[PDB]
DNA sequence: GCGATCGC
DNA sequence: GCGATCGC
């Protein structure tokens, strides 16, 4: 249970990896949707600032069909 | 502006 | 099927 830290509209936010729904790479933005206690949203961080657990989630998603 | 993607 | 997010 690691927390992903990201900036959204200037604010500092955090979401546990277990709340992440979908992860993808848009350019160098590791992007993701999540549902945090009813709050559905989207976040993104640079690949260079993403925690290993998020990158591993990303690799698992890149392995599957589109 | 572009990338990938979903809310609405 | 745009508008919207971030990183670049």
Curated annotation (Swiss-Prot):
Chief localization: cytoplasm
GO molecular function: DNA binding; RNA endonuclease activity
Domain of life: Archaea
Keyword Cytoplasm listed: yes
Keywords: Cytoplasm, DNA-binding, Methylation
The keyword Acetylation appears for this protein: no
GO cellular component terms, semicolon-separated: cytoplasm
SUPFAM superfamilies, sorted: Chromo domain-like
Record field: pH dependence: Highly stable from pH 0 to pH 12.
Temperature notes for this entry: Hyperthermostable.
PTM characteristics: Lys-5 was 70% monomethylated in form 7a, 25% in form 7b, and 20% in form 7d. Lys-7 was 50% monomethylated in form 7a, 40% in form 7b, and 50% in form 7d.
Record PTM N6-methyllysine, positions in chain: 5, 7
Subcellular location: Cytoplasm
InterPro entries: Chromo-like_dom_sf, DNA-bd_7a-e_arc
Assembly with partners or alone: Monomer.
Protein family (similarity comment): Belongs to the 7 kDa DNA-binding/endoribonuclease P2 family.
Function: Can constrain negative DNA supercoils. May be involved in maintaining the integrity of the genome at high temperature.
Note: Sac7a and Sac7b are truncated versions of the Sac7d protein, most likely resulting from post-translational processing, or degradation during isolation.
Protein's name in the database: DNA-binding protein 7d
Lineage, top ranks: Archaea, Thermoproteota, Thermoprotei, Sulfolobales, Sulfolobaceae
